[PDB]
Design a protein around this nucleic acid. Sequence first.
DNA 1: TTCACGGAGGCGTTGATTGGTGGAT
DNA 2: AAATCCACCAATCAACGCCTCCGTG
Lengths: 92, 107, 51
Amino acid sequence: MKEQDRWLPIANVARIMKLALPENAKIAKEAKECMQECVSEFISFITSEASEKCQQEKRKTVNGEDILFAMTSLGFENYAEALKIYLSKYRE
Amino acid sequence: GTARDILTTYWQHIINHLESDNHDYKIHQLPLARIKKVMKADPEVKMISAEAPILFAKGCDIFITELTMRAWIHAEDNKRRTLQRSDIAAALSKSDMFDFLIDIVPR
Amino acid sequence: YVNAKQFHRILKRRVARQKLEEQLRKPYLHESRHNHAMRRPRGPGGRFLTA
DNA sequence: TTCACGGAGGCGTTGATTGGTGGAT
DNA sequence: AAATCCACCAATCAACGCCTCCGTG
Ligand SMILES: O=S([O-])[O-]
């Protein structure tokens, strides 16, 4: 376990922030670091909820449906229902 | 054009692009292996299906975008064109959906 | 007050993070890439260019 | 016994990491 | 006035995606 694996790469995060803003807009290094920490916790927060349900049902694999179910439980229902459409298309 | 009006229809535009786009699961803004390593940092997690990182790549794209747009509104209100950490902190306080980040972004 | 749907998971993550820091920003991540960037030919404006 | 599927490890890429300066603020 | 700090640039190498092989259920 490398300590730096808790976080997504900052350049990839920074690029998505850039595309979400006007062309003239600039982003402070602290805003990029803050966003990196927030989106990394988003993954861990949702994965932990999915993980505990997988363990309770004695399933070894966290699957796509577990992530969606965890997103609904934790009140990310826009994300759960949007990614459900995305998933069905990926399997279509 | 207004930062608020773009945010108020944000999910309509997400659903339009989901329902009518040439999704290339080939290309992702976020590397899948790194998403998987964040998941595996939790000792409770054993195995992960190939679909779970793919969902997180798209989910995290949407999440970074929504939060950046909410934060940009605060930057616009203070007549600044640089996005600051304080703009993200201000955005997090406006929705209880972000309560999970209370320890990541204190006060 | 706290999101009722997130309350329990927030505290599990706090304990898990407190445990993770126990068993583990630098100016840069890698010494080699740090040295590459300190070595390369720079333009007058401080930008890198093709070798 | 075969089928479905995800980890481990090897291979061929491959774009994230990186800092000095101008000028915006 | 004088200081702070982010976009700009592209080549190396840490690591990403894909593959094959094997273990599990
Ligand atoms: O109330 S929760 O933020 O600990």
